[PDB]
From a paper:
Bs-MotPS assembles around the rotor depending on the external Na+ concentration. The crystal structures and SEC analyses of MotS68–242 at high and low Na+ concentrations revealed that the periplasmic region of Bs-MotS is in a folded state and forms a homodimer regardless of the external Na+ concentration.
The crystal structure of Bs-MotS68–242 was determined at 1.89 Å resolution. The asymmetric unit of the crystal contains a Bs-MotS68–242 dimer (Sub-A and Sub-B) related by a pseudo-two-fold symmetry. The N-terminal 15 residues of Sub-A, 12 residues of Sub-B, and C-terminal 6 residues of both subunits were not modeled because of poor electron density. The overall structure of Bs-MotS68–242 resembles those of St-MotBc and Va-PomBc. Bs-MotS68–242 consists of an N-terminal α-helix (α1) and a single core domain composed of three α-helices (α2, α3, and α4) and five β-strands (β1, β2, β3, β4, and β5), which includes an OmpA-like domain. α1 of Bs-MotS68–242 projected from the core domain as in St-MotBc. A short helix following α1 of St-MotBc and Va-PomBc does not exist in Bs-MotS68–242, and α1 of Bs-MotS68–242 is connected to β1 by a loop composed of five residues. The subunit interface of Bs-MotSc is formed by α3 and β4. However, the helix–helix interaction of Bs-MotS68–242 is hydrophobic, whereas those of St-MotBc and Va-MotBc are hydrophilic. The crystal structures of BsMotS68–242 at 40 mM NaCl/300 mM KCl, 92 mM NaCl, and 300 mM NaCl showed almost an identical dimer structure, indicating that no unfolding occurs at less than 100 mM NaCl.
Author numbering:
A (entry chain A): 84 to 236
B (entry chain B): 81 to 236
Amino acid sequence: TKKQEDQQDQLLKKVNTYIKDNHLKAQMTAKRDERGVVLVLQEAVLFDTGEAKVLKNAETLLHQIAVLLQTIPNDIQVEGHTDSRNISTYRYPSNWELSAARASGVIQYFTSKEKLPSKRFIAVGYADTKPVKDNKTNEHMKENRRVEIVIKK
Amino acid sequence: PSDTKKQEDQQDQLLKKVNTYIKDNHLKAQMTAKRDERGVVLVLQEAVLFDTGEAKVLKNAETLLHQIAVLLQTIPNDIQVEGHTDSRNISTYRYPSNWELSAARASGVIQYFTSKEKLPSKRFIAVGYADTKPVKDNKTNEHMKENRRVEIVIKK
């Protein structure tokens, strides 16, 4: 356990150096928690509101993330999170479906376009069950709309 | 030493209760149960829940899902619903890939549980595995059929 704090710090340092070197600080942030090292991407850099298709302009960002993931062996868990708003549609009848569609759409890009191996990935949808703070203000809901790319321990 | 055995014995009792529930309610043709390192797992082949390539829960399945919700109501565990496909690459306009179909199927089950059966949202996690976790492999049509499934994981 004492040596796995060192390797988690090494990885977080490597990810933060990659973000610096590639000038990605406005598009993503990285952190460390019990899951491992986590890249957080706000909804606006990947999708339109209430949609789960990866925007053409997000492809460069996901490519740069793929380049990083290609150099490490860890399994990758992509989590989708929504705010608590009801923006239901025919394609996404609830936040469960929307959050799971966003996670799986990111993974579809990583595996089908960037050719990272499917076996490294798990798609996870949390709907609105894991807010950053809450959904009591517009700013709090906006930060709840995110994808988290978890570089698993 | 007795702690490993204690936890494993408790998991044995949980699986026994689930199997007895399946038996007593005459559900053997629709679902099976097993356990592994994740916990105790209910397995539902896709045809008891969905039509082919779709993630809309069938009206037929509402009775089965209600009986499962009654079971889930009696235990406190977190519930992880996993969607699985076989390895055959099919797309569609709404589900461009097995990743999206598998996650939409897990999501659709949870949405039924939380909207229609009123189980609390915070108990659930939706998981999509595409074809990465076969029951055994994809070497035969019958193995591919059993791979198209939803697993409801009663987490440890």
